[PDB]
Structures are given as structure tokens and as C-alpha cells.
Amino acid sequence: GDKICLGHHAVSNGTKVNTLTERGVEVVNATETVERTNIPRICSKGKRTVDLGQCGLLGTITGPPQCDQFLEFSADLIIERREGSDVCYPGKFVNEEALRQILRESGGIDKEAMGFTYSGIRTNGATSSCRRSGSSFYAEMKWLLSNTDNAAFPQMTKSYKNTRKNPALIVWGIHHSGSTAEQTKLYGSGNKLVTVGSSNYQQSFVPSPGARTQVNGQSGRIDFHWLMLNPNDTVTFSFNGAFIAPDRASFLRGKSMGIQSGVQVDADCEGDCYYSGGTIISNLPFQNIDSRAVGKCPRYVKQRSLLLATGMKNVP
Amino acid sequence: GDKICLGHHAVSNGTKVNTLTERGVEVVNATETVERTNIPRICSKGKRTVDLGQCGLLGTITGPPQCDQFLEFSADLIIERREGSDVCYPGKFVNEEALRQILRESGGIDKEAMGFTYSGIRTNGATSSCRRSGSSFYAEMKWLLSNTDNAAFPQMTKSYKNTRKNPALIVWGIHHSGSTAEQTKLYGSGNKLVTVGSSNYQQSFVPSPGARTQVNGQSGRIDFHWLMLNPNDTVTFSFNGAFIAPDRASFLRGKSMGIQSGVQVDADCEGDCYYSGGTIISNLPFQNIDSRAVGKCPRYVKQRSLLLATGMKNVP
Amino acid sequence: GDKICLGHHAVSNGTKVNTLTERGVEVVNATETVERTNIPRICSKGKRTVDLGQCGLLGTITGPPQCDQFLEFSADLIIERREGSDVCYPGKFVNEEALRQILRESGGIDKEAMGFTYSGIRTNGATSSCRRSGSSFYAEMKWLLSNTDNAAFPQMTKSYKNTRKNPALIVWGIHHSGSTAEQTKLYGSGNKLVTVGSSNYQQSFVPSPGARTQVNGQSGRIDFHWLMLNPNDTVTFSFNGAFIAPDRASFLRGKSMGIQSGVQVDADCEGDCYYSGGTIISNLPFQNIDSRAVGKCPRYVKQRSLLLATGMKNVP
Amino acid sequence: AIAGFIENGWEGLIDGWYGFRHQNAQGEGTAADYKSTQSAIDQITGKLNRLIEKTNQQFELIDNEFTEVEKQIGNVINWTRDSITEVWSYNAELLVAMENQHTIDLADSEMDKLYERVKRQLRENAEEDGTGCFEIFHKCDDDCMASIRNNTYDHSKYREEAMQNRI
Amino acid sequence: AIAGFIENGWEGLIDGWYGFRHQNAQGEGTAADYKSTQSAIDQITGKLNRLIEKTNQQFELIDNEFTEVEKQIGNVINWTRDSITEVWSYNAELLVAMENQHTIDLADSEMDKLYERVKRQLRENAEEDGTGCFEIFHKCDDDCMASIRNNTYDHSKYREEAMQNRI
Amino acid sequence: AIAGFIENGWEGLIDGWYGFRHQNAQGEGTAADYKSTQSAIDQITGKLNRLIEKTNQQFELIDNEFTEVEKQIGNVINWTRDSITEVWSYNAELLVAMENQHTIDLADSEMDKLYERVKRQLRENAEEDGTGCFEIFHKCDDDCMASIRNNTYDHSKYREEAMQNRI
Numbered sequence A, B, C: 001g002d003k004i005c006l007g008h009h010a011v012s013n014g015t016k017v018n019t020l021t022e023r024g025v026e027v028v029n030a031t032e033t034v035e036r037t038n039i040p041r042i043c044s045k046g047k048r049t050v051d052l053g054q055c056g057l058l059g060t061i062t063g064p065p066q067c068d069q070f071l072e073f074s075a076d077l078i079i080e081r082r083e084g085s086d087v088c089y090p091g092k093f094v095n096e097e098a099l100r101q102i103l104r105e106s107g108g109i110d111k112e113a114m115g116f117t118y119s120g121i122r123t124n125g126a127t128s129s130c131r132r133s134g135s136s137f138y139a140e141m142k143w144l145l146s147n148t149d150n151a152a153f154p155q156m157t158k159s160y161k162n163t164r165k166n167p168a169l170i171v172w173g174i175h176h177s178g179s180t181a182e183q184t185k186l187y188g189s190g191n192k193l194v195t196v197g198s199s200n201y202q203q204s205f206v207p208s209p210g211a212r213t214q215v216n217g218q219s220g221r222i223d224f225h226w227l228m229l230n231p232n233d234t235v236t237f238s239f240n241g242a243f244i245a246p247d248r249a250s251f252l253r254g255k256s257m258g259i260q261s262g263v264q265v266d267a268d269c270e271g272d273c274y275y276s277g278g279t280i281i282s283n284l285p286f287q288n289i290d291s292r293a294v295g296k297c298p299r300y301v302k303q304r305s306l307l308l309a310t311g312m313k314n315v316p
Numbered sequence D, E, F: 001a002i003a004g005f006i007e008n009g010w011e012g013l014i015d016g017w018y019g020f021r022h023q024n025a026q027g028e029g030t031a032a033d034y035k036s037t038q039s040a041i042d043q044i045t046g047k048l049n050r051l052i053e054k055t056n057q058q059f060e061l062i063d064n065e066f067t068e069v070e071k072q073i074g075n076v077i078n079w080t081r082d083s084i085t086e087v088w089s090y091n092a093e094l095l096v097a098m099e100n101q102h103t104i105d106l107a108d109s110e111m112d113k114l115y116e117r118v119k120r121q122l123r124e125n126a127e128e129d130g131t132g133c134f135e136i137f138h139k140c141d142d143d144c145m146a147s148i149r150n151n152t153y154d155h156s157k158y159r160e161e162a163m164q165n166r167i
């Protein structure tokens, strides 16, 4: 008897997948859905890229020696590194991380002089912790001392209008001396106040002199503070010592992204999702590599693998 | 041969939809799932509604001139506007936004006198920045000066118990004068402290006098601070100048919602999901209008449109 | 005619469930998916468990009387209670909740002496608010007074290196006296500063003396502050009064979890998801008991019940 | 000449979703079938009731358009909100995709159920032509066509005759 | 008289999900079919294993019942948590709805598969009655009914006789 | 001896997903069927296009690996992120499970559709053997097997002969 049979294909090596109803049912074919594959490099093709290396991001605004190349840097992609430091003379920024988040998407910075000038004080405060050709200081700032040791410090006001169309990033410092003796040697006796107001912003600052742990030969510290000054607004600085004054305001250039990483740049490969270990190049919807990956990324998931079937049940 | 056929309907103009397996398969009918339609007005039917206009929300507690109508306002729906200002004499609240979030769901406020009285000082501090019929001040507060110019300022303590059953909102101010000369003209020489403790709360305040940018004729600033005083607890205010004292405590009435908007009220239409551009009236599960919409809302999504099929495949 | 019929089972009294297409279709059987069942006890079997009772968690670091049993406690599961208090002499921690979150997952604490010694001052500050056998103080701290009433307070520096391999938790206090008269009786005249620097951390402190509400007989307050001191780093304390000094640093033991609860421990039942009302023992994927439940938990959902079908349509 | 669902749909079937087209000596005719139509409509209406739900949860401003909140917390809020938007966007897309597949399949299935029902009431008195019709191997006047439609057709009445014409 | 799944279920089928009811001279009888029953049970058990999973992720307090955290961060936490609750509530609802539809359909499908299997082993020796039964056009004693159930029925043995009674 | 899909698959069918195995005097042969194959492939490819989408939303660092953010806000961020990870992990698992069920069923359904198509073009000239084949009750040479495959087989041509051999 003549007959015709209908059938479908099959193979000996089925791939196991999961369904609503069964774990490890075999299908003819399947494809991975969770990315595990990583390129151990920063794929920068098509993007202006700044590798800050020794230079801390916030340092680009104040300008310790490590950051000299980057005082007006310009970028699409910004890479911070572990060894980066924001300082030379010991100290830290208040609200540091917010400010980092601003600079990471800033496109870089452009610097304008604020035009302060000074009478009856010194301006060349310096220290062995910030060294270029011997003792020096933060490039974008001026360490104002009294005119001579112990001498009194003229009370002063200085202001600056932001005449541009974007907001201006303003930064200053409070010097906290290793002793009260050093505070007087530098700014003279009396207590010391520093007051800073725009219109949008009012705040105030007293130095806390006192012994601390010696960091880079230094027992003193510099508190850095900052604000955004709106277009046409003015910032005014009233003070009588312990003031580290800005020489230049900063302005944000455009748009960028910043990452933190421990691997080389590679301008020959292209990418859009990054993490500390490299770049994730992948069309898969999900990934199991790093939950803190940034850019335009597959969604991070707990599972190593989720196979998606791309053929029928295998019945061999 | 007689025959009977089974069939289904169809039309020439199918609607295209997406499925698990195919983009743009045609069906006989479909309905939108993502709301794009907006009523350019605040639909307030059935709700007591306060349009603060010129008056800043936080201003209802302190009472600059713009807020005179609203010192004891009462509402279900509260609308803030762009032009609203919390102040007359320049200054800002510390923790402002938290306090806004409290007032937005407060139902409004009811004001009780705290019953402070005063000896050997003045009470009628005033300024051209806060004007009613000529120079005046924040309605709910008292600007305490020294008796006579340069005169000394008696150290003082004043307290207030919350004898109600709900917590009481307490507010006070620190006056930061445009110079040290003005600070002495007002409260006399010497340094100046203001200390504020309930039991639940301890904090302290020094004025920072100094030049700032002139904001509506004023170089000075008033820092406003606040706390919640628990039922039966007492707040006590120790101070010797630069203190802007509360005359009245506030109490929250019930429940409300607050929005920020740029469009008219309309009591004739009804609604429950609002945003800056109007009200979203819709039974759809999703919307693509504004991610910050508030009330009881469809879920915000990225897509303009997601059609849901409401008939079969179209095979014409 | 002989015949054979195919059929399926059914019951009177089906269970109603929902589907994509229909509300309340009856099936032969179904099972709940949302947990509502609660064990009104903390199931601690297999876990070292500390019930802090009268003792506030942060109090384990400073050591008011209530916390004497727990100064070096050790645990897998830590239970806080409503009546717990961190203090004896009134006051609070700054950044309190962060510190609680650290101690809850700490495994408990181990205490090392910081080895401070003192010359030309007293050390036995005490108060009726902290009582053991009569007047006493925080066990882990030393209330430093001037050598005699009104007497001047030698300016001092004291430091401590963390020579262990983990970070050390350091705690100190600022005494805010009920008046300026009491501040002087205790530490003498003059203003008073306390400055605290590691390398990683710089901050400063002035006392605010002034009248406050009397809390357990006391008009004064103690501000507690803290930091993590990194391995090999030093913390240094410069100060001239109003300083409540640490005697011992703390170190975290291992891992734990902490809960807040109002019900008894039970070592005979076992569990891993807890809330204020008890323990939730359940294999169900979801729960409708408490949204703040912690541990390893079913996901909290709004609905009381979602039945999942475990048989076919019922057609009786 | 006349064809069924295996070929295509009927742009002219206007008072139903599913129906019958017959051909006999009295001519040609089309009638809608109510139960199968209503069954598909009820099922779709079920979905609508499920997906038109209005949320009962209220949300408030956490953010401010007029006076921006501090940057750190504002960025955390923005990231939280964006992540949530991803989730809802993915859910919405999936739901619609999934439901549409299901709506399509459900409607096919209802046509299927009607055809296999008719096949069974015709027993041995007809054959499948392969376009979704049956060749009936006997004379079926308008009343006999109506009895198939309202499910009263008795196959034994026409059997001996039909069985014969198939041989 | 007896009927099958197209009409309704069998409240009396007690030792299986799917089964056979027969009618012959020796009388009436009902037996469960093990493989189709167990296949539906295995499949449902598969779902249970998937949806009874216990999460391995641990969460800790971010908030405090006894001493409230600062308002701003407390509101942000509350909004984050509420948004997450919406998500899980929607997911839970959808999952159950979707799985129930699938459970129902799966069970139908298993009945379907059993019926179309039997139809095929009976070949030309029987006809569909339209309630889910077969009229067998020959005498089928208890042993012959048992051979259909355990899939050993040989249609050629009964063919010439059955073919004839259908004519 | 030859069998179809009801028993098992064909490890030897290499140039298609679905196919025909025939047996006649000229011998044995296997050919793939293009349309049913391509229909299943298109449908799967549809899923791939849907699930290979690349998100367009950008996310930035909210956190810092080198210098840890304050503990309170860091814990809130970590809890928010962990909750989100739960959601995506659950979604991913469900999606794949759900799609795989659907892929399996879809492929069965396409085999089903091909078999029931063939059954209908063979009309009264063949019978179902129960393994996925048809016993054809007439001589079908290589060309006649090819006409069934490309859907040109005219059943009336072979009817009178076939009808007879099955009676």
C-alpha cells in the first residue's frame, strides 16, 4: 500500500530550555539572552576621550599640579581612575559627589577670569605639597596671606557677575590651620569669618584651626566649597582671612558621560555601555556582568543564562 | 452540489498592531492603550481649591504681604505657581522642600498664638521690602531690635508648649545683616547666639553678617528654620539678637494634594491626575504626556502608542 | 449500538479564578499565591539572637546603664524594641539612622581601649540621669571637667591609630550646657572649640549652651558624633572643653540582620522573613502582610488573594 | 462560486463576526451566527475590563519644577524614576504584544470550534471541500440550511440518500 | 444514555482527570486514563515548581518605625517603595491571569489529544456522535472496550463487519 | 517501514523543518515543505527582532567605586537598585519561559496545519494510519506524490478507484 507521511526535523544533540510548564525540555535550537561577554577595554571610537589618570575630576576646577593638562579640558567621554586625586594640599570638597556628577556630564570646562585684585595683603601663599618647580599652589586659586607674619588682615569684599548665558561654577576654600599659632602667623589674631552670598544662596564659614593627622607633610586642611551662579547674578565674598580665593570661574561646555575604570582606552573599537572592567558590546536585552554598568545598556539580571528557543521540540 | 461554508468577517481598512511574532499584522479593530490627550486646565470639581498665585507656599506660614489671604487657608487641592514667592525681605528656608511636601498634603493650616511678650526691646522691626501701607514686616513674626541704636540686647529665653493633640509647626528666623555695623546698630555689639531646643531636637545658630548682592534693595538676609513640636512637648528659644521670632504656631488641618501648574482652574470639569500642563482624564492604563504627573494616574511610558487588538485578523 | 465516550472529571462546588479573558471562571482546584498568614513570634532557631529590650542600638556603643549587658554583644539576629533608648543624659546622635543601619548588619561589636590619659583636669563627670549605684555616666566615655569649678581648661590634643585590619568606629560627644554659667562652672570662661580630624575626614564643633526643655531633670544636651577610622589611619581630637571623650573604639564582628518588633522570640521555630508583627513562614511568591518586611521575603503586593488554578475548567 | 475561512474573510458579513454562506437551488445566502460571535465578543470585553482598570494608588510630588532640589537627591530621584519608566514601558509593550497574539488566536479558535461542530452534525452526509465549506451530498432547501445553522439538522433523515451519492 | 466532554464533565469520574465511559450489552462502565491524567498533572506541577520559588535576595531596613527618618529622604523612600509595590502587584495579577488561561487551555488540549487519538485507532469502524463519543458499528464486549483503552484495538479485525453496518 | 510526527521526528530531514516521507513501488523518498518551514522561521524571527531591541535610555553613575558616598543615601541607592534587579530578573525569567512555551506550541501548530491540509486534499482517497501518515487507497507514482506536495493533487481523478479499495 502506497502512503505519504508528514514529519518534522530533529537532531541527536537537543538544547535544553525552560518553559512555563517544564524545566529542561529539549529543542532543536536556542540562543542566549543574557550577556556574559566583556571587552576588557574602553571602546572610545567616535568619541573625544579624556583619561584623567593622576588627576582627580574635581581637581580640574581647582588645578593642583596633576591636573595642569586638564584645566580647560573638552570631552564626550570622561574616564576617572583610582589613583586620581583632587588635591595637593590636604582637604576635600563639601558636596563632592554631586559636583562630580555635574562634571561627568558637562562636556568639559571652559575657564574665565573673575578679575579680583588685592591691596595690602600677600597673594603668593605656597606649600611644598603643591609643587611645580619647587613650592607652589592650586593653579586656579590664590592663597591670600596677611601682608607680613602676624600682621592684621584687612576685612574685604569682592564680587563677580556671571555675564554669560549659562550658569557659572564658582569654587572657594577655607583654610583650617594646624594650630592657632599658624592661623595668626598667616592672617593675624582675632577670630575670622568668611561669608558668601549670591541671591539664590546664603551661607557662612568659620575656620577650625587645630592639630590633625599629618597628610602629605601637612597638618592643615583646605575645605573646598562650591555653587552654581545663575546668568546675570552676582556672587559676593566677604572675608578677613583663611580664604582661598578663586581666580577663575568655570563653565560647562556641552554633554558627556563619565565612567570609573581600570583598563585601557581603545579608539579602534566602538561602544555605548561601560563598566569598570571594560565595555559591553552586545545586542542581548540582558546582562550578568555588572549591576553598575552605565551608558545605554542591557538590563542587569541575577541569572547567568536564560536560553530562548529558536526551533521546535526535539523528538529524536 | 449544495454546500454550506463557514466564514468570518473582514474589512478593507484593517488596523495594524504588533504581536509576539509579527510587527504590523492587520486586525479588524483596535483601541489605544497609551493616553496622549490632555485637558489644558485644572479640573477641580468636588474639591476645595486654593490658587496661591503670587503667594509662595512656605510664605503662608510666615506671611509676607502676598500671602495675607492665605494665612489660615483650607483646601483639598493646592496649586502653586511659578511667580509665587515665599519672601519679602530676602532669604530662604532651610529644608525648604521637605516643608513644602508637608504643606502640600496638609489640608491647609490653622494658626495659634504662642503668646510671647517682651521687655526692654523693640518689636517693630520693619523694612520697605515688606510693604502694606508703607514699611512693614512678615505678618506672623516679630523682628526684635534692641531698645535704642547700638543699645545692648538683653539675653532672653521664651518657651511654648504644644497643648493640642497634633504636632505643631514652629518657624523662626536668623537675621544676617548687610554689615557688622548694621548688626550693632540693630542688636548692639558683642557676638550673638540663638539656641533652639525642644526635647526631640537640639540645634544652634550664629548670624553671619556681611555684604551680599542687593536683592530688592536689601543686602541682608533672613534664614528661616523650622521644626515639628510634638503634643505636650515644649520648644524653647534662647537668644540675644538677630532673632526673628514667631508670633503664631501652625497646625495642619487634614489631607490635601498640591500641584505646580501654569493653567486655569475649572470647577466645572472633574479630575484626579494632574500635571503642570493640565489634567489627564482617561481610563487608559498608560500615558505618554508627563512623567511627573501626580494624583491617581495611568502609568507613564516612553511610547506614543500601543494599539490593543479588539477583533480578529483581517483577511480581506 | 455499542459506544465509547471520552470525558473529564468535574465537581459540584468549583473554585473561582480569573483569567486573561474572564473573571470568576470555575476550575476544579486552585491554590493561593498571596500569603496572609503570620506567626506572631520571632522565629530564631539556628541564629544567635540579641533582644535589646530597654537598650537602644546606638547605646551599645556609648553604654548608658540599660546597655551594660550589650557593650560587646555578638549576634546573627538583632532585635530592637520600642522602649529602647540610646541615652541616659539627654541628647542624640548626628547621622543616627545611618549608624543604626551599620550596627544592624555588624554581627555585634568588639571594644578596644583607645588609651587616652589626662593631666590637670577631672575625668569623673557624672549625673543623676545615668545611674548605677547613684550618680554615674556613659560607660564607654569620659566626661572631662576642668580641674576645679570655674577653672580654666588646658587646651589638649589626643590621637589614636587604628592598628587593626578593619575600620574602627569612633564616637565622641559635645556637651551643650543648660546655661553659660554652667558651661563656665564646668570648663571655665572663654569660648570653646573641638576639632576632629582623621585624614579622610575633617569637621569642627562649637558648643551651644542655652536653656532647653528639662528632659529627665536635664536642661543640657550631649550631641554624639561618629566616624569610621580606616586601617592604619589616625584620628586626632583637639579641644579645650565641652568634650565627651571616647575611652574605647568599636569594631564590627561579622554579619547580622536587625529588625524592629513587638513580639516574643521563639528559638523552637525557624524563619527568614521578619516584620514588626512576627515572622512570615511561607513558600508563596507574594505576601499582603507588611510592605516593610525584611529578610528573604515573598514580594509585597496590594491584593489579599490571587488564586492560581491547579486543575481544569469545571463543567458539572 | 463560494468559499470559506481557509481562503479569506467576507467583507460582506456585516451583522456578525462569524457566519454561514450557503448555495442551493433557491440561491445564495449569508447569515451571522450569534453564539460564536458573542463568545468572542464576551472574551475580548473580558480583556478590556481587565486592562482598563484605573489605579487606586496615589503619588505626590517628590521633585520641584520651579525651584530645583539639591543635585545629589535630585539625581537619585531622576534615576529611580527613569528606571521605573523602563519597567512600565517594557511591561506595556509586552502586555499588548502578548494579548494581541492571544486575541488573534482566540478568534481563530472560535471559527475552528464552529466548523468542527458543523462537520459533526453533518456526520456522513457531507465532505470537506478544503476552503472551509462542506459539499452536502443531498438536496438542502432553505429550511434544511436553516436547521444546520440553528443546530437542529438530523443527519439520519438525509443519510441513506447522501451515503449513496458519495458512492 | 451516555455523553462526553463536549456536553459536560463527569462528577463521577473519581480516580482520574480524563476517562472513558462505555455502553454495551454487558452494561455501562467508566475507567480513568492514566497517561493523559499524569501528563496534565506533570505539567501543572511544573508551574508550581516555577512559581513556588523562594527568592534568595536579602533586603534590610531602610526606614524606621520607632524614630522617623528625615522627611525628604523618608518621602523619597516611600515613593520608591510604593512604585515598586505597583509593579509587583501588576505582575502578580498578570501572572496568575495568564497562567490560569494557560492551565485551562492545556487541560482542554489534553482531552482533545486523547479523543483524536481514539478516533484514529477506531479508523473506519466508528463515527463521531457530536457529544464526545463514538458509535461503534460492531459488537464490542468488555475485552474489546479494554483494548481501545490500552491502545491495542486492531481495527482490521472488526473492519469488514463495521464498514457494512455503516451501509 | 515508515512513520510520521505522531511517533517522532526525522533526524534525516536536513533541508527543512517540516516535510513528506512517501512509500511507493518506485521506492522511498523525503522532501522538505518550504511554506510551512518558512512560516515557522518568519514567526521565530519576529520574536528575535522584538527581543533583541537595544534600549535607547541612558543611565549614569549615581554611586562611586573609588570614594564611597554617605552611608544613608548609599543604602537607599543600593536598596533601590537591588529591587530593580529583582524585577528585571523576574521579567527575564518569565519572558523566556513564556516565549519558549509559545515557540514550542507554534511549531506544533504549523505541523498540525500541514497535516490537516493534506488530509483535506486527499478527501475520500486515503485514511489516517495514526502515526502521522495516510494510507492512500490507489497507486501513487512519483508524480502523484509530487502533486500532493505542491498542492495540485485532484482527488476526483483517483476517486472511483480509491473509494472501491476501501470497500
Ligand SMILES: *[C@@H]1O[C@H](CO)[C@@H](O[C@@H]2O[C@H](CO)[C@@H](O[C@@H]3O[C@H](CO)[C@@H](O)[C@H](O)[C@@H]3O)[C@H](O)[C@H]2NC(C)=O)[C@H](O)[C@H]1NC(C)=O
Binding pocket: A029, A030, A031, A310
Ligand atoms: C540557531 O539559532 C541561531 C540564533 O537564532 C541562528 O543564528 C542566527 O542566524 C541569523 C540568520 O541571518 C543571524 O542574522 C544576522 O543578524 C545580524 C545582526 O546585525 C546581521 O549582521 C547578519 O548579517 C544576519 O542577518 C543571527 O544573528 C544569528 N545569530 C547568532 C547568535 O548566531 C542559527 O543559524 C541557528 N542554527 C541553526 C542550525 O539553525
Ligand SMILES: *[C@@H]1O[C@H](CO)[C@@H](O[C@@H]2O[C@H](CO)[C@@H](O[C@@H]3O[C@H](CO)[C@@H](O)[C@H](O)[C@@H]3O)[C@H](O)[C@H]2NC(C)=O)[C@H](O)[C@H]1NC(C)=O
Binding pocket: B029, B030, B031, B310
Ligand atoms: C472597535 O473597538 C472599540 C473599542 O473596543 C469599540 O468601542 C467601544 O464599544 C464599547 C461597547 O459598548 C463601549 O462601551 C461603553 O463604555 C462607556 C464608558 O464607560 C459606557 O458609558 C457605555 O455605556 C458603554 O458601556 C466602549 O466605551 C467603546 N470604546 C471606545 C474607545 O470607543 C468600537 O465600537 C469598535 N468598533 C466596531 C466597528 O466594532
Ligand SMILES: *[C@@H]1O[C@H](CO)[C@@H](O[C@@H]2O[C@H](CO)[C@@H](O[C@@H]3O[C@H](CO)[C@@H](O)[C@H](O)[C@@H]3O)[C@H](O)[C@H]2NC(C)=O)[C@H](O)[C@H]1NC(C)=O
Binding pocket: C029, C030, C031, C310
Ligand atoms: C488541589 O491543589 C493543591 C495545591 O496544588 C493540592 O495539594 C498539593 O499537593 C502536592 C502533591 O503532593 C503537595 O506536595 C507536597 O510537598 C510537601 C513539602 O514540600 C511535602 O512534604 C508533601 O509530602 C508533598 O510532596 C503540595 O504541597 C500540596 N499543596 C498544598 C497547598 O496543600 C491538593 O492535593 C489538590 N486537591 C485535590 C483534591 O486534588
Ligand SMILES: *[C@@H]1O[C@H](CO)[C@@H](O)[C@H](O)[C@H]1NC(C)=O
Binding pocket: A232, A233, A234
Ligand atoms: C540683570 O540684567 C538686566 C538687564 O540685562 C538689568 O536690568 C538688571 O538690573 C540686572 N540685574 C542685576 C542684579 O545686575
Ligand SMILES: *[C@@H]1O[C@H](CO)[C@@H](O)[C@H](O)[C@H]1NC(C)=O
Binding pocket: B232
Ligand atoms: C505632659 O503633660 C501631662 C499633663 O497631661 C503631664 O502629666 C506630664 O508630666 C507631661 N509629660 C512629662 C514627660 O512630664
Ligand SMILES: *[C@@H]1O[C@H](CO)[C@@H](O)[C@H](O)[C@H]1NC(C)=O
Binding pocket: D071, D074, D075, D078
Ligand atoms: C530631572 O529631570 C528633569 C526631566 O525629567 C530635568 O529637567 C531635570 O534637570 C533633572 N534634574 C537633574 C538634577 O538632573
Ligand SMILES: *[C@@H]1O[C@H](CO)[C@@H](O)[C@H](O)[C@H]1NC(C)=O
Binding pocket: E070, E071, E074, E075, E078
Ligand atoms: C511612610 O510610610 C508609612 C506607612 O507606609 C507612614 O506611616 C509614614 O509616615 C510615611 N513616611 C513619611 C515620611 O511620610
Ligand SMILES: *[C@@H]1O[C@H](CO)[C@@H](O)[C@H](O)[C@H]1NC(C)=O
Binding pocket: F071, F074, F075, F078
Ligand atoms: C553598595 O553595593 C556595593 C556592591 O553593589 C557594596 O560594595 C557597597 O558597600 C554597598 N554600599 C553600602 C553602603 O552598603
